[PDB]
């Protein structure tokens, strides 16, 4: 009936999601489990490992890490913007709203997606070719040692919900289309789309996890956690942007962070 239109939207978004993102939760788990046919990731547990590992990857250690982390985020933003464009109705909006939606959305989605890549112990990197340990990241000097830790904490809770790439494809769409971001010119059409996306997300959770109930409600509670986690992060960038003049922030990243929370 209507459940058809929503089933369609969910498949369109999954398709778009898979085209747009190189490393899915599917392969990432396979790699993390190790139950895969590919060569294991080069573990990075200390400065020695890091230096040996430098060859298998795309200035003091901590600041080097942060610049890689920077390079990668920018690629994330491109993958996310490409995806946003494939959300039915997204590109019909005011271009200034598109920018605002993304400006506020991207860090929420990075963290959602980082979590596909994380476990209690550490995080995959360079498209599953590295595995940088959580112990190693904590160990970095202030402020850098507290930079990734809030994201591991979030990840352990979020990964519990045992979501699928197909669930995430819609879940990230719903995030992008948040009609309650600072400075939108025309909220109604955004909210229109989000209601569709939220119905499709609800259907998808009933269908894909018919044994689990309230995954939908659990999942919407997490959407509020992120905004906080993202604020905590933007704050940290201010701290880093000030106490280090040795580093330069990437132009695209500046765009996002300037006049943001």
């Amino acid at each position: 009936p209507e459940s058809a239109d929503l089933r369609a939207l969910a498949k369109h978004l999954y398709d778009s999601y898979i085209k747009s993102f190189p490393l899915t939760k599917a392969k990432a788990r396979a790699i993390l489990t190790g139950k895969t046919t590919d060569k294991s990731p080069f573990v990075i547990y200390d400065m020695n490992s890091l230096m040996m590992g430098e060859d298998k990857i795309k200035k003091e250690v901590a600041i080097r890490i942060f610049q890689g982390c920077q390079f990668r985020s920018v690629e994330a933003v491109q993958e996310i913007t490409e995806y946003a464009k494939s959300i039915p109705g997204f590109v019909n909006l005011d271009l200034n709203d598109q920018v605002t939606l993304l400006k506020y959305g991207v860090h929420e989605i990075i963290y959602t997606m980082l979590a596909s890549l994380m476990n209690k112990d550490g995080v995959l990197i360079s498209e599953g070719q590295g595995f940088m340990t959580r112990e190693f990241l904590k160990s970095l000097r202030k402020p850098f040692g507290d930079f990734m830790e809030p994201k591991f904490e979030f990840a352990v809770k979020f990964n519990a919900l045992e979501l699928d790439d197909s669930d995430l494809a819609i879940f990230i769409a719903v995030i992008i289309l948040s009609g309650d971001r600072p400075g939108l010119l025309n909220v109604k059409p955004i909210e229109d789309i989000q209601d569709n996306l939220l119905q499709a997300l609800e259907l998808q959770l009933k269908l894909n996890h018919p044994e689990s109930s309230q995954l939908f409600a659990k999942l919407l509670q997490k959407m509020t956690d992120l905004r906080q986690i993202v604020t905590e992060h933007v704050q940290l960038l201010q701290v880093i942007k000030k106490t280090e003049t040795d580093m330069s922030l990437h132009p695209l990243l500046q765009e996002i962070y300037k006049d943001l929370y």
Binding site: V77, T81, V91, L95, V99, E255
Partner: peptide, 10 residues
């Protein structure tokens, strides 16, 4: 938001 516009515009 120069680059964002560009990215979106593409």
């Amino acid at each position: 938001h120069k680059i964002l516009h560009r990215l979106l515009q593409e």
